[PDB]
Amino acid sequence: FVNEWAAEIPGGQEAASAIAEELGYDLLGQIGSLENHYLFKHKSHPRRSRRSALHITKRLSDDDRVTWAEQQY
């Protein structure tokens, strides 16, 4: 119970990395093989039992317009 938002985005690259910086998360989702995927991870309390991921519910979906965006705890 932490948070791992995985999403595939074709061109929102500059935005993907921008979200993490805009809200406050570490974006790591581009493997290069798919060159579009981008995932954020930030909570400051990864105790596998701490609900959070609130600030990531703004520029995430807003930027998610690219294609699709979903979280994963």
DSSP assignment of 23-68 equals II-EE----SSSS-EEEEE--S--SSS-----TTTTHHHHHHTTSE
Cα-only R_g, the chain: 11
Q: Method of determination?
A: NMR
Query: For the chain, how many structural domains are there in total?
Result: 1
Q: Which of 69, 46, 57 is nearest to 24 (CA)?
A: 57
Helix/strand/coil for 3 = coil
Q: Which domain holds residue 13?
A: 1-73
CATH number of the structural domain spanning residue 25:
3.30.70.850
Phi and psi, residue 47, nearest 5°: -100, 20
